[PDB]
């Protein structure tokens, strides 16, 4: 039974707080856990308007990996849009990464554009209901769209089965975010030697109400992971509704990729 | 003879370094009872965009509450519930919006008075609890030249003294969103005393537990003695974070405050 | 003949570069010179859109003074809008300041609002010709107006008598700036114990084509400095057109306020 | 028999760590002669908003020049003048906009060839000038995992080796606006060689002084020998920054380049 160092990466608009129940669960099995806020997320001091690409949004993860001591490897667990943060970081630090784990997450490939799975998500789920949108121009002239997730979307689609205290916490600390979709459309594809070579484990539930079953099935078919684990029940936030199920699958990933 | 049950509009105020998030279990408990609940981030707290170095006094820090009260409709009154250093936010607010406040509830909170300096209960808090363990301190210089001491609460202090009996998920949450804070004690020491007419006139309920490991029973009893509450509610057990360890008891006492002061 | 530590503060949109001729002149007399870039000015890495007040714009000066060793005092020399940076810094660090020197500069008082002399400048000089304006919302909801100074305004009003290499350098490194005027209108007045108590020396020329003679005369009449030096000729950028005249007056300020 | 004087459109390219500002005396000298002059900041240089850590290769660094050439009108050609490491920007550009370039002018510059690797003249520069004195180095990891070495040029190196004979006002200016830079040498070592058809076909003028204290006469002569310029112009005196110490001579040679290549 292997203990491991996990780096947990929240999705846009959220912050490390989404991992507050999974991080103790994991530490109870002896694992070391790091949960990072990405730029302008959680209590990071930057505003979204100063972030110019998804690669700049990933800076807390890249800096972390940058400083990881020689010879140490981590398992990066990313939720929803954070599959893009795993792919960005894996192209830069492939030798520091024992495995990438995708938790009801976007699963980028090497063959199509970095925005491809974002395009496919928005095709499967085009209406973000009461979500609001805004734009700014980044330092190079591109117009970036930000969003403030709507509370009906949060209650019914993202936190579908979460307790009222979890849902309320989400509304108390949620921040603006961006897909940087057009910037991703312009980004070079993820490399085969980096992202393409890491081990990939995909955790999902078909009860997810925003990364819907047919999109998740399309992603697995489009770019087969090494392992797919499906959890029965729960909702999009499996680390809150099926916390011990996720800590157990993650124990299997530690055993397998050390 | 006649029984009365009332629904109130509660405004929940967190202490320094924290944010609206500490009320994430009490706010739903209260809404289950039918109350209206507003939980505000104070300046540079929770996800408020300001940084503590841009804030020059506890009154500026209190801006989100004063703005909110400025915006309340004619003839709406709220019950302001504040934890720990937020009793000072309740005193600042009542000297500006006394007619908007049905009662102030001090929840293991500083209880300011009108007779001594605004920093007086902070001096006595620190006399009672002088060593904040692994807390780190920093300073900056404010808009008129005062040096302001800020702090990042240490994680042992958090574990053992503030979140003593909270869940691991709750204590991990706190480490994930805690921010810098300041007592602004020296600027409070230069402040005019709280007025009789504003703050001195509001109904005041003191909720506390003698199991609190940072606002200790000697301190808490000294404040009760120093400025008698209109009501005192002692909760058995729990810890400093009663809204997390005794959520339903706190909600039930808050229903009793609403029945009494509407 | 006293040597002194001078801290030179450029005006909005400019940067420490405007002092590149006065700083060696001063060092030739044995003075120590610090020339700072304010936030989003010169090569400071921040953009104007993340600065929320003139007090935040002054952060490089406040941090500097913050770290000045105990017992050391500086003479702060500020040009044009930098008279506001001297007043902000003097309220916070009055004991670290031997004198404030105002070089064709705004001269704030304690009696009226911090924006008062900005209001008066724009009254005397309402048309900034080819200057362009933009707005953003700051972190507290206020709309902030920024400007990009026009090159005809730069050539004829600001750098009137400067050489072609100085004028060209200005166009190569000029950046957006802001008066934060509405935020200043909301700011508490400068204190008598801080700004009000520092020694104040006012350097100007009546050949300045944007801080015009009657506005500069109004400022001196409105808030009498301890000393007024008038240089014959030159233009708004006296530190480029009358560099040795300014280094000599500054030698007199060092002698006088050590 | 027939004499010819021509006005050209010059595009001036600074070296790493610097920006358009180094050309502030040559750009007016050239405009006095009637030429059109464009002086560009390259990525993360001068007042360009990007930081060097966001830039992943010398080609990305070259984006402001390539954009500019992309936008040039049909049938307009420019003479790209580049100092020191900007000879690599001229080679990147000519393999994309060869038809837009009337000539490339290397001004105490790296002179890339098509036979060796793009990093070849950088290897030889460093062999010739290995100790950059008080320069500080840093790294970051780029978009595909390469570690990129960046540097803040030391002020002694600036005083004595790059701005050897410049004015105090000029040398103080440089300290006021110098930024981090990178040779991107290891990513240039992975790059395809410059093409014959693009870069190899453009007219090339080499301006230099043997008084340069960082691109030394052994190095400069080695490059001339290694890839013969179409024209060589040696300026007597000055220093590395010929556009500041021999501004009018450089402008006069540039008039001769315009007369020859329009």
Curated annotation (Swiss-Prot), chains B, D:
Residues 9-246 form the AB hydrolase-1 domain. Acetone binds at residues 15, 84-85. Exact pH optimum pH is difficult to determine due to the fact that acetone cyanohydrin is very unstable above pH 6.5 but HNL activity was found to rise from pH 3.5 to pH 5.4. The pH of the cell sap of damages cassava leaves was found to be 5.3. The active site is at 84 (proton donor/acceptor), 240 (proton donor/acceptor). The keyword Lyase applies. The record marks 212 as: Increases basicity of active site His. The keyword Lyase applies. Transmembrane segments: none annotated. It catalyses: a monosubstituted aliphatic (S)-hydroxynitrile = an aldehyde + hydrogen cyanide; a disubstituted aliphatic (S)-hydroxynitrile = a ketone + hydrogen cyanide; an aromatic (S)-hydroxynitrile = an aromatic aldehyde + hydrogen cyanide; 2-hydroxy-2-methylpropanenitrile = acetone + hydrogen cyanide. 2-hydroxy-2-methylpropanenitrile binds at residues 15, 84. This enzyme can be used as a biocatalyst for stereoselective synthesis of a wide array of (S)-cyanohydrins by addition of HCN to aldehydes or ketones. Optically active cyanohydrins are interesting intermediates for the synthesis of alpha-hydroxy acids, alpha-hydroxy ketones, or beta-ethanolamines, all of which are important building blocks in organic synthesis. Keywords: Lyase. One of its GO terms (molecular function) is aliphatic (S)-hydroxynitrile lyase activity. Signal peptide: none annotated. Disulfide bonds: none annotated. Its EC number is 4.1.2.47. Involved in cyanogenesis, the release of HCN from cyanogenic glycosides in injured tissues; the release of toxic HCN is believed to play a central role in the defense mechanism of plants against herbivores and microbial attack. Decomposes a variety of cyanohydrins (alpha-hydroxynitriles) into HCN and the corresponding aldehydes or ketones; two natural substrates are 2-hydroxy-2-methylpropanenitrile (acetone cyanohydrin) and 2-hydroxy-2-methylbutanenitrile (2-butanone cyanohydrin), but in vitro can also act on 2-hydroxy-2-methylpentanenitrile (2-pentanone cyanohydrin) and mandelonitrile. Belongs to the AB hydrolase superfamily. Hydroxynitrile lyase family. Homotetramer. This is (S)-hydroxynitrile lyase. It comes from Manihot esculenta. The gene is HNL.
């Amino acid at each position: 039974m292997v203990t491991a160092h996990f780096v947990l990466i929240h999705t846009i608009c959220h912050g490390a707080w989404i991992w507050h129940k999974l991080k103790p669960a994991l530490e109870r099995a002896g694992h070391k856990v790091t949960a990072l806020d990405m730029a302008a997320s959680g209590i990071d001091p930057r505003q979204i308007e100063q972030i110019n690409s998804f690669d700049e949004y990933s800076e807390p993860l890249l800096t972390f990996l940058e400083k990881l001591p020689q010879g140490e490897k981590v398992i990066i667990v990313g939720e929803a849009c954070a599959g893009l943060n795993i792919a960005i970081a894996a192209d830069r630090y492939v030798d520091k990464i024992a495995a990438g784990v995708f938790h009801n997450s976007l699963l980028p490939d090497t063959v199509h554009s970095p925005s491809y799975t974002v395009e496919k998500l928005l095709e499967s789920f085009p209406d973000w209901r009461d979500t609001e949108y805004f734009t700014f121009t980044n330092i190079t002239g591109e117009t970036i769209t930000t969003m403030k997730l709507g509370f009906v979307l949060l209650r019914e689609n993202l936190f579908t089965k979460c307790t009222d205290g979890e849902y309320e916490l989400a509304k108390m600390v949620m921040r603006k975010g961006s897909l940087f979709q057009n910037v991703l459309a312009q980004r070079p594809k993820f490399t085969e030697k980096g992202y393409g070579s890491i081990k990939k484990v995909y955790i999902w539930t078909d009860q997810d109400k925003i990364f819907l079953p047919d999109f998740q099935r399309w992603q697995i078919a489009n770019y087969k992971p090494d392992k797919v684990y499906q959890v029965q029940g729960g909702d999009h936030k499996l680390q809150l509704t099926k916390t011990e199920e996720v800590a157990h699958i993650l124990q299997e990933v530690a055993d397998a990729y050390a």
